[model samples]
Target: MGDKLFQLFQLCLSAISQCSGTPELRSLYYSICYRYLTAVVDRSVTNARARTLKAITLYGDRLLNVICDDAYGSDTTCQTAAMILLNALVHTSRASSPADVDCPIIDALNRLNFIGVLVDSLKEILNEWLAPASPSQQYTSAKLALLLQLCQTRQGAKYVLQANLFRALEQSGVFAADPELVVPRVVALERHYALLVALARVVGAAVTARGAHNIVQGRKFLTQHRGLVVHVLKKMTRRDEILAQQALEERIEELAEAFMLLITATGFLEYES
Candidate 1:
């Protein structure tokens, strides 16, 4: 069973790398890839899943290239499908061993400048979300979730920080508009809130990760974005009543605490006051 499953997994990876065929065909391959990574039930199947993940990581560069290409184009279907596959792979790998910090896929991603691609993709998604007729929230949420997962890792977090993701968020007006004002205008209020929460967590994770290694760089980041950070936090706090009604009060509080801790750790509290 493991041998057969591994063979099929390799075939799907190869097909996906070709990046040809009909959209439906490509989507089917991506779906198969996700299933192979996640359909682990018994012990033997679990071993198969591990081998499949390793195989997928071996093809990481090609898969990432497909995503990079799709990101530049106007169409987002392929990009979304590719990200769903990646998210599943990342989740399965983390679930297998939470203590294992070494991640082959993330290493490939960092080497390939995946963070740059992510920022570009994020700009596009945010713009679309702000348009009169927005795209699917599912697509936006998948990309954000993938990013959040990446930021959870030390190496991934450092790469994200080095990419200056916070600046992209700011430029996208992510921290500028009040959710209360914009939520009513948006198609999916929950997705808008999710993006806010995810971005906050992303910022927190990257800063914490950088602080763990180089306190100086983290402090530099805080100095650069101190006002924007404070602005967003204050807005969230002032509107906690609404977020509490949405069951996101805890997330907002945790985000505020994270920023406060970092501010104190980086000695930016004095600067803020």
Candidate 2:
């Protein structure tokens, strides 16, 4: 086990992706401090301080840079970064210097301010994130699952939605937007926010009562404020669904179906073709 750990650590620094996708990466990454994370917290516990911390920092740095570097990094990289950050954070109460590591994590967090610039062009953001990259070390269903699990903060959801990923996606034509549609740009905007709506709901629900309520309500959010979710989300800056639907009740079911599908399937697993 010790030899394997050293070998993995070396690979982490040398590999183009740090071999993050393969079984080797998962085994080594999870083993960072598994034995201790499950145990009760106390001063009495102590062991493998050196080896474990090494692995933790390596993945942790990559994770932070990938996720926190919102302006520069790919969506996949950002998601992978969250996985490492969460794993490290979950075990910090047991760390030798919790304060030391937490500071940088928070620093990385401050960098997520990219949403301010992104709010108006989120569709553009999503298009960029979903676009391809050279390395497999980037995000996948498993890594993305970790990102969704950890990115439950209000700041997290706001930025992701504000990124206007749907508009970006629509522009890419990856979802197969109809060419004949009158407003081809705004066509599937509702469906786009629908994914973030689901993810935020689930993450919020797992974290708190208020979060739970927010999530319960989040399903509606995807379509409830379709105007803003579009202006700030789908990047539909000009359209107004609010005025188009004359009857209030008719819009109710319209929002419901989008929410229903959102809560049921917006994570990485559902993302794959």
Candidate 3:
């Protein structure tokens, strides 16, 4: 029965997807998908996961679009389910360090064009994150945290830098806009603060030993926009003292290294500081 159930699970992607066409079955479908993913993560046998990962990969580009799309009514059911699945995959994707090999799911995702999905997800969440009413902050937090999980792997970090993540930070207008135009300095802005921390960590990874192409991209970005990067991040730190402390405590060293590397590489810095 167990083996049969496993094969059934692999064979029923279309059926499960069909269930999502109606609101009635949507949550249940996602719940099942989430549980199936949880089971994969919990399994001790490595080949068990390999089989399932291969099975799911067979779904091909259909899976990618469902997971990545964010157009109108996109999050209503199946799309959100796919996002949840992707998030679960990342949960199993993290490695202890960049030098450590990535999880199998990381390669699968990248092959399926995970970079574009990640970039698009950032753009989507930033819209909600910066909204005045703060209505979608929960989704924003979830999305940001999941993206951070992606950066926890070496290949993920490479993909992030290649996608030009700094441009998302710049285009966000969070740092450059007038203080009054920005989201107020309040508890509601905590999620936005979290996203910044995640982004800073990703930036930090780009300057590390494994990130050659990443460094090139980071260097060019910093040369053109060093002042803006400092301007916004400093203002953000000022607005939230706790956030300021957290950034300094958790990521300041690496973030500083990334900046110094970029500046030196671009020759924006000379001799000693």
Candidate 4:
């Protein structure tokens, strides 16, 4: 196991080096990294913390070329790097005492061009994890359940869905990438209805004033992307029994919360920004 890890580390190191100048080299290195991740590491998302982060920072913008490019970066590496960058600023030696003395992750993200790009790339991987392995294939109830088991948490769902599943759905495009597994159009609204229910329930009832503002934008996004929320909710509902149950639970909670919010709204104007 130790030797295999060392080999994987070296594989990542090589990929980073090849990523320095050539886009073609970038592709090769990326393929190599993907094999190690999907086949070797087999999706161990937690293990990305031990990377040579300083080396990544040393490359600066050029390195950003690699990190942002999924062809070259793995979520395992990219996410862990993001977390490390977070810790360095807030929880490490760079932060003040009691705060972990670490440098801010955003400070580091600023140096990398593809924070947004990296995030999008990971979204693609997640789409596959949630959907069928090949677009040419149809979803089996079992496969979709497996996909959710591996995903569907904050790291799985929020990062992939940006913590706003409805908004993420709204951003989606035509399903040409795989017409075979396409989500049917008729049930779209009902899907978003369920998702909005999920979102309200996910955030809960104790959010502060600022958090409320965030929730409003989030709700607006849901309104806009209600169709998308419909698509994913349906897709998951078709496959994962557990998600299906949670979806019902989420809708129930959301309905109850909606009533609570309605009652709470009239007097909260003084707190509104």
Candidate 5:
């Protein structure tokens, strides 16, 4: 195992070198990293942590910057690779106890001021998702989930506040006269349930991190279109049961918290009349 890890570390070095300065091959570069990173994380705990640490120490900043660029650069292949690498890296680090401090990927992300790009990329993909005329095939549910998960941090919430996220839904005509219709559209797919779950969790985190001002704008739309709130909450109601086997109780909690925040922020108090 020790010798194999060393060989893998050397392979990462070679791949990084080959990828450097070759903008034409950034997608391939990210794909290679994603494959290796995924493999390492799927192995034993010790093996996963060791390779993640090694990969990060050598090319953490580089890999992060490339992935960020590729994700926002509008190439679907690169975008897919970017999402795969990030999800694998984060999952690997999360496996370690108190791993935040020692995880180089997270540290590089912080140092590189990643929140803006991550948020922008998220909005871009969501914009695609919201395009009624566009096919959902453009954005895979897995990549969508990864995109949302990557940006639920304090910084992610900060950037989310900067943009009028919920307002975009209204402007895009998604929150129209029959806003409740959106709920069935999402839930009926069922395959995209994970994406909705991630969206709810991120919304909760963003509201919590940025407080009333950030959430209030979105809340206004939800208030004007009460059907949206009702349907979304209804969809989230069974989230615990749906995700129970997936070990995503925290995600369900976030969804519930988001619903609570949605209710409170929108001033959905009972009728006094």
Candidate 6:
């Protein structure tokens, strides 16, 4: 069963790569990829996972190319599905080998400049969110969650930093616009706050990764964006108070930790209060 399942998985990947067919056909291949990959990850059997990882390492670049192509285009559905699959593959690999220097899947992603693609997608998603007729909150949050997961990795974090993620956030007007004013008044306060928390954590992860190496370059990046960073920190702190007043303890903790990580990484202790 495991061997056949792996074969099926490979077939789906090959089909996706060769697919210049209709959008429906391509989406079907993506769905098959998700199901097969998810099954392998969920099963407790070690061999299945090992085989899946090996398969991913072998075809990782092509998989990422399909994802990148969809991500750069206007196909939100395809992009979201493909990203979910990629995120699952990375998460599974990381879980299986926590101490490994770098997962083969991650190396493939980095070689393909996946972080640059993500930054560009972030800009477009933010634009869609801020448009007069905004997309669903769930859609926006789903995309952001994928980014948050990627940013949690050391290499992913560094890639995001080098890709100028902070600049992308700023250019998207995320730091300039008040969340309450622009985050769709129809959405609940918690929803908007959740988005902010996700953004904060994403930035936090990348900055924390910055501390791992390239101190001089990281410091220069921080200095260049000092004002914008401070602004985000200030907003985060203000939201922390609101979360506290509302007794949303979980989000408050996440918000506080994110701000603290930012301060520690950037050495901006003056704004740590």
Residue 253 lDDT, candidate 2, scale 0-100 = 42
Local accuracy of candidate 3 as per-residue lDDT tens digits, 85-121: 6676566434112357766566666676666556655
RMSD of each: 5.1, 13.5, 6.1, 11.0, 7.2, 5.5
By summed lDDT, the worst window of 10 consecutive residues in model 5 runs over 179-188
- Alpha-carbon local distance difference test for all models: 0.66, 0.39, 0.55, 0.36, 0.53, 0.64
Give the poorly placed runs of model 2, Cα more than 4 Å off: 7-55, 58-107, 111-122, 125-147, 152-273
lDDT of 2 by residue, 84-198 (tens): 4344443442353421233333334435443333333333433443345532334333333433433444444444444543344345442333211333323244434333433
Ranking by lDDT: 1, 6, 3, 5, 2, 4
| Candidate 5 residue runs with Cα over 4 Å from true position | 2-6, 17-29, 43-51, 97-107, 110-114, 121-127, 130-143, 151-198, 208-225, 232-273
What range of 10 consecutive residues in model 2 has the weakest lDDT sum?
178-187
Per-model TM-score, in order, reads 0.73, 0.34, 0.63, 0.35, 0.60, 0.74
- Among these predictions, the greatest lDDT belongs to 1
- In model 5, state the lDDT of residue 161: 50
lDDT, candidate 2, residue 225? 33
Per-residue C-alpha lDDT of model 4 across residues 149-190, encoded as one tens digit per residue: 212222222232343433333344322122224343323323
Q: Answer with 1 or 4, whichever has the higher TM-score.
A: 1
The worst-scoring run of ten residues by lDDT in candidate 1 lies at 182-191
Best of the candidates, TM-score: 6
Query: Which prediction has more favorable lDDT, 1 or 6?
Result: 1
Which digits, one per residue and each the tens of the lDDT, describe model 6 over residues 1-273?
Answer: 556767778877777766567656666777777788777555557666777777666765766787656644566566656666777777777766653347666667778887676776566655565443344444566567767766677777767777777677767655455544543233344554555578877877766664556444445544555564555455445665555545544554566566667666766554333
Candidate 1 vs candidate 3: which has greater lDDT? 1
Per-prediction backbone clash count = 0, 10, 0, 14, 0, 0
- Model 3 is weakest, by summed lDDT over 10 consecutive residues, at 175-184
TM-score of 5: 0.60
- Cα displacement (angstroms), candidate 1, residue 5, comes to 4.3
